[PDB]
Write a protein that binds this ligand. Structure first.
Ligand SMILES: Nc1ncnc2c1ncn2[C@@H]1O[C@H](COP(=O)(O)OP(=O)(O)OP(=O)(O)O)[C@@H](O)[C@H]1O
Ligand SMILES: Nc1ncnc2c1ncn2[C@@H]1O[C@H](COP(=O)(O)OP(=O)(O)OP(=O)(O)O)[C@@H](O)[C@H]1O
Ligand SMILES: Nc1ncnc2c1ncn2[C@@H]1O[C@H](COP(=O)(O)OP(=O)(O)O)[C@@H](O)[C@H]1O
Ligand SMILES: [Mg+2]
Ligand SMILES: [Mg+2]
Lengths: 53, 467, 477, 508
């Protein structure tokens, strides 16, 4: 039982790490999109304020 | 024609021409200046006024200073006498070795070759480097992106490419440094002098440097890539040969363009870049092509902001790249040189229709075996080497031999490796890797493949170290 | 100086000249500058005129003389353009002589209304097994090709163009398709190589190529799609069929964003103006399918979009997905893995072409689609069978490059695959079997394929003979 | 359209021919004044960035020369300036005094003493806006700039003529790195070796006056003012002074560089000079860019930092090291000014708050820190020990995740964890207690040869101290040999071996 349990824990941790890696990839893509969008939004606010004087 | 400076806002200068206006992109020289100041026209505001971006510090200018219209855009001295000479964006030498004497001058604002001045067939540029020529061949007249760029061999690789291209095909090269650190610029000058690609005595240089310093106004760092293109276009058209053009860095090209656009008073685009980002890049990258006379193969060092591959700068540059090289810190650790990531490197012409079926099959087999070894390394780390089969230990051995064989000794690094540099032709590389994949050399030791030229050198090394 | 039919450039800069004069210039009219360029007069203002220059602003100077041509922006159209490359204004750039066209069409002409059109009823054959069986494209449809950098979209377009030769070499005037290829913001090297590839496949004699490569000013990249769409509307309104391939429609959006920002317009989301949706819908609404009271012609459209990192829910991809009649999602993961064409049949759909599919292909591809759909959900006994069959089909739909297939060969191959003849063949050898089987049927049994093509269905006798052929060949393999 | 000089007063003057009695070439009349920006009519013969002087005794820098008017930025409160005032040319671009007469003096951005110790000697003057050297005058960075900090000198070496960058968050230790670097140079300045003396300049942009006063007290306590200049541009100072102070410091250091001596300039903090320039640009109605910063803000810092050079012997051989400090907000090294200055400089000392509280002070985060100069800026002995230390630390950083588990892992990983923990406890340093290079090399040599694999990690900080005091007292000949020689000779290696073993033989 202990041998099989340790094998299963190794497999489960490997799969969990793989899933966390896929989720990290997706969230990194989302974070980059959001960061660029925030830069653009702040810059457009500044531009509109400057041109609206 | 003579005008007057009417306004000076930062690096932007508004001039007034009572007689006749210069066309856009012309170069104007400010009279009454201790050091040559050149202004590039960018707008026609009306009322005979033009707005110009300054190529040098505008401090000390007065409203009324006379400005003389040259009549043509920035014209630089191009020819065979620029080889081994550093010169800034406006063509003035900055290496203090006297004037760049030439009988030719070229305007830096030219147009891409017309649709009929274009090679219709792809080609391959043989650089004499195993990894580059096998896993990511460099298309002739195609942009190559080069990643990494920190203590991994970027400069030594650039120098080796210069040497091989000037030795195999005999073409010269240009090194346009866009926004170049002065410390690193001087260091590079001296490294080139040491390795021999520049010769201050006998005039047998193989590279012409063009430095856009990092402390020049934004209007100068934005145009040095064009000066480099002009120096290389001379060799392509006039000398009718294949040139190399190293642009280090291209992200700094985009940054300088963005700063100039902001200074002129233009609304920024998506991430605060110039609204003309795509065209600003395209006008330059479209002059690096294979005309029917010669060709220019460019090598951009590329920086990815925030490690974001979708940022408008690399998202726009990657649209132009025809290949990719990825120097990796993780491979210089292993002592492999050049530390080119065999798997992350990419090429558009790695296609059986272009590079031929045998080259394509060898490259695909090498990539597959390297991926297999990479996958197996996890099993080795976790379950221990014992767990492998006999049809997997063999692949591990073959992949280690291939990794060793992909390393090479450079001619411009004989003071780092104690060996003598090798310029491996293409057929030698393909045959060597085909033989290693076939298994013909499974009996040799792995270290017999480390840092050798063609496969026959591996055989000789095995004989010399076993006997 | 005549201040009615002529003006003087007040201020050049940004690629938007301000002219003073032209008191009788119509909105959206084309004017000609002294140097040789041409421009379009957007902003008829009280005191000046805002002309966007279709070229490089370097050539224009303050003081230059602008002369109105007297006609709205239009391009030369006709049969005379087939086999020629042309810039965004219809001026030839392949140096084979003057274009010499008799008819001129406006680029801003409006799309046909609701009554002229009719449902899509004819198939547009692409010679790509995945596209023709799983996401069929009819004639008059607008099928977006959306993907990433280097995933094989231009390959789909060029395979379609090269495949149309079976019909453009025959005699049936109702099947000939005249292709148009618009290249926007795209390396000129690529356009030249593509034109050579077409010339080598004898596919230029019925193809127009409009070029707005990356070295061309933003207004030309903005205006190239409309020039191409007018060149195709000529055939559409004359009872002939056309196929226009905008490539890409994201480079056009970038060019239009440049144009708008330089005009100081309020940037919106991702700095794109508010007109981008209108910019593209104005264009893709012209790919209609006229009814027999208007000629019966058609104009297919295959816009191409390059997503960024696989983001399909971006702004411009979603606009063009809200404009078009389907999708062909090319997945980068699949492409790098080895599946090519990398069409992600899960997310790729065809709104309209399903009814236009050919019966012979329709019956076989129905069961192919069911089998692939079942396999998609399981990736014991039934599960193992589904995995095996799905892998067989997936390796069956891999295809070469620049080697389009006639519908009959696709029918034969997919029939062999879906009827379980390959259920024993090792999954790796499916491609080898496919290439050998195609040669076999293309050499000896031309009668069967010809009968399938003519009858337009897999009749029971055709079914039996095909069964015999495939089983015998599989025995001898 | 409209101009700012079309006000009815100017037109009134010009209609009735009253514009000929006013000298509009060397004098001007303020049209507008607000938020520290004056718009002046006249001054037709005024140069860009020239200094004008208002009637009320104030100064200003004329930045925006437009067709109608001149945009002057006032060097102080605009309370004293009123519309209609008279502004006179000074004739000269802004310059500052320079020389050894500044050493030990606190000055403001314009070279005026503010410590109340009397006038400032000031034999020579120098323009703040002077172009940096070129490709040719410089030569590669070879000499070391002894920081006195074990981490910085071992794993992030700083040469002379290099532009490092102390980038970190708020309250992590950046000013402490700077002050320890300044204080460690006393052992060289006191001595007689004339090519090791380093003169220090501390530019304090945007800090409150109490901070600078405490800093000056700290330097005086350590007797490290006699070779230090401090240039204060505190928060109450007008934006132009905060903008200029880095350039005044850089010119006061370029003086030392041009005359064969060596200088160290610590622009602390550059992210506040950027803010001051942003203010000036926005109030001059210049087109903003990302984060509202002007377009030429990369130019502002590049033309400043590219004056840190290592002249060659044909020019004097002097040098000017630069240590710009930047405060990142959360960890964002991808922001605008952090990005610019990371792309301008030659390395970076990246400080942490996770490491600061985990007990690793100074919080230099190796792995993110880098020095593109590297071993070229190290002594032979420091090279010898630091190569192994860096290799071992790199090995330790990729198995530090297991540090919690540690046990139930192979012996190699256990050894890596143990050696890494010992080395990290070794790189810990006090505050304002720099160490000579011989001391550092002795300590790191003891650490990296395994002679601490027996001591418990909690006791390494006490070992280091006791062992260092031992060697410093009993064994001066060996330390002097290592120092003057510069390398570890085989006999010196044996002496270090025996010393470390004998002291460790009984430590308890
Ligand atoms: N069916 C296929 N089989 C094998 N290889 C293919 C196939 N289709 C495309 N490729 C490969 O993909 C590469 C890029 O193809 P393609 O130009 O069609 O993609 P793209 O999206 O048009 O590229 P870009 O986005 O750069 O214009 C080609 O070099 C080709 O070798
Ligand atoms: N190596 C060290 N050992 C012990 N204390 C330290 C060390 N380094 C810094 N400190 C302490 O941490 C506190 C903050 O340090 P310091 O002010 O130098 O960082 P800082 O980033 O300059 O702060 P700020 O940037 O907000 O001015 C100080 O009180 C200092 O005494
Ligand atoms: N072929 C090679 N043989 C030996 N050493 C090499 C080789 N290529 C790179 N290196 C090593 O890489 C280091 C960095 O070199 P270089 O690329 O010139 O600096 P940078 O990467 O900063 O441009 C050098 O110290 C050199 O020893
Ligand atoms: Mg394409
Ligand atoms: Mg501080």
């Amino acid at each position: 039982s202990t041998t099989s349990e340790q094998s299963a824990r190794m497999t489960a941790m490997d799969n969990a790490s793989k899933n966390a890696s896929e989720m990290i990839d997706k969230l990194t893509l989302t974070f980059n999109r959001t960061r660029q969008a925030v830069i653009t939004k702040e810059l457009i606010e500044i531009i509109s304020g400057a041109a609206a004087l | 024609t003579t005008g007057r400076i009417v306004a000076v806002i930062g690096a932007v200068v508004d001039v007034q021409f009572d007689e006749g206006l210069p066309p856009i992109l012309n170069a104007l020289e400010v009279q009454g200046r201790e050091t040559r100041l050149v202004l590039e026209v960018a707008q026609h505001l009306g009322e005979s006024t033009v707005r110009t971006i300054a190529m040098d510090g505008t401090e000390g200018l007065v409203r009324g200073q006379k400005v003389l219209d040259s009549g043509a855009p920035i014209r630089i001295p191009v020819g065979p006498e620029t080889l081994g000479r550093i010169m800034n964006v406006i063509g003035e030498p900055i290496d203090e070795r006297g004037p760049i004497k030439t009988k030719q001058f070229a305007a830096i604002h030219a147009e891409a070759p017309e649709f009929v001045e274009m090679s219709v067939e792809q080609e391959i540029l043989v650089t004499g480097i195993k990894v580059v020529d096998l896993l990511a061949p460099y298309a002739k007249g195609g942009k190559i992106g080069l990643f990494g760029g920190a203590g991994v061999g970027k400069t030594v690789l650039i120098m080796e490419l210069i040497n091989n291209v000037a030795k195999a095909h005999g073409g010269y090269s240009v090194f346009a440094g866009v926004g170049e650190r002065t410390r690193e610029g001087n260091d590079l000058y001296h490294e080139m002098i040491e390795s021999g690609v520049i010769n201050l005595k006998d005039a047998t240089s193989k590279v012409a440097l063009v430095y856009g310093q990092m402390n020049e106004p934004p209007g100068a760092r934005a145009r040095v890539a064009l000066t480099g293109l002009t120096v290389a276009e001379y060799f392509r058209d006039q000398e009718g040969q294949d040139v190399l053009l190293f642009i280090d860095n291209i992200f700094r090209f985009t940054q300088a363009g963005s700063e100039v656009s902001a200074l002129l008073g233009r609304i920024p685009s998506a991430v605060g870049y110039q609204p003309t980002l795509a065209t600003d890049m395209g006008t330059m990258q479209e002059r690096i092509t294979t005309t029917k006379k010669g060709s220019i193969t460019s090598v951009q060092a590329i920086y990815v902001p925030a490690d974001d591959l979708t940022d408008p700068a690399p998202a726009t540059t990657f649209a132009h790249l025809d290949a990719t090289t990825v120097l990796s810190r993780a491979i210089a650790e292993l002592g492999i040189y050049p530390a080119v990531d065999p798997l992350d490197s990419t090429s558009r012409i790695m296609d059986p229709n272009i590079v031929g079926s045998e080259h394509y099959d060898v490259a695909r087999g090498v990539q597959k075996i390297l991926q297999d070894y990479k996958s197996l390394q996890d099993i080795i780390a976790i379950l221990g080497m014992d767990e492998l089969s006999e049809e997997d230990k063999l692949t591990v051995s073959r992949a280690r031999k291939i990794q060793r064989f992909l390393s090479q000794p450079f001619q411009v690094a004989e003071v780092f490796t104690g060996h003598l540099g090798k310029l491996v032709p293409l057929k030698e590389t393909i045959k060597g890797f085909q033989q290693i994949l076939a298994g013909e050399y499974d009996h040799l030791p792995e270290q017999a493949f480390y840092m050798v030229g063609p496969i026959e050198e591996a055989v000789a090394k095995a004989d010399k170290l076993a006997e | 100086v005549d201040l009615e039919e002529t003006g003087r450039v007040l201020s050049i800069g940004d690629g938007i000249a301000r002219v003073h004069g032209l008191r009788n210039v119509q909105a959206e009219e084309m004017v000609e500058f002294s140097s040789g360029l041409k421009g379009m007069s957007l902003n008829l203002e009280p005191d000046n005129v805002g002309v966007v220059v279709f070229g490089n602003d370097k050539l224009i100077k303050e003081g230059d003389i602008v002369k109105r041509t007297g006609a709205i922006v239009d391009v030369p159209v006709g049969e005379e353009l087939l086999g020629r490359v042309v810039d965004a204004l219809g001026n030839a750039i392949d140096g084979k002589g003057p274009i010499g066209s008799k008819a001129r069409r406006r680029v801003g002409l409006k799309a046909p209304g609701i009554i002229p059109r009719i449902s899509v009823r004819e198939p547009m054959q692409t010679g790509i097994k995945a596209v023709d069986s799983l996401v069929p494209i009819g004639r008059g449809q607008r099928e977006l090709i959306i993907g990433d950098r280097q995933t094989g979209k231009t390959s789909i377009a060029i395979d379609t163009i090269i495949n149309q030769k079976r019909f453009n070499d025959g005699t049936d005037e109702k099947k000939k398709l005249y292709c148009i290829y618009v290249a926007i913001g795209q390396k000129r090297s690529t356009v030249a190589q593509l034109v050579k590839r077409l010339t080598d496949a004898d596919a230029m004699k019925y193809t127009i190529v409009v070029s707005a490569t990356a070295s061309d000013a933003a207004p030309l990249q903005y205006l190239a799609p409309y020039s191409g769409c007018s060149m195709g509307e000529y055939f559409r309104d004359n009872g002939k069929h056309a196929l226009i391939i905008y490539d890409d429609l994201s480079k056009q959006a970038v060019a239009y964003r440049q144009m708008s920002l330089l005009l100081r317009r309020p940037p919106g989301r991702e700095a794109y103006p508010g007109d981008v949706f209108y910019l593209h819908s104005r264009l893709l609404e012209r790919a209609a399918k006229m009814n027999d009271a208007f000629g019966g012609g058609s104009l297919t459209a295959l816009p191409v979009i390059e997503t960024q990192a696989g983001d399909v829910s971006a702004y411009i991809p979603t606009n063009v997905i809200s404009i078009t009649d389907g999708q062909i999602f090319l997945e980068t993961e699949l492409f790098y893995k080895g599946i090519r064409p990398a069409i992600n049949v899960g997310l790729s759909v065809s709104r309209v072409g399903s009814a236009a599919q050919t019966r012979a292909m329709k019956q076989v591809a129905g069961t192919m689609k069911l089998e692939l759909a079942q396999y998609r959900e399981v990736a014991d006994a039934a599960t193992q069978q589904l995995l095996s069959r799905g892998v067989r089909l997936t390796e069956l739909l891999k295809q070469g490059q620049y080697s389009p297939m006639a519908i009959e060969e696709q029918v034969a191959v997919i029939y062999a695959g879906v009827r379980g003849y390959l259920d024993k063949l090792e999954p790796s050898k499916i491609t080898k079997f496919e290439n050998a089987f195609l040669s076999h049927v293309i050499s000896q049994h031309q009668a069967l394929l010809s009968k399938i093509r003519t009858d337009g269905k897999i009749s029971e006798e055709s079914d039996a003979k095909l069964k015999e052929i495939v089983t015998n060949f599989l025995a001898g393999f």
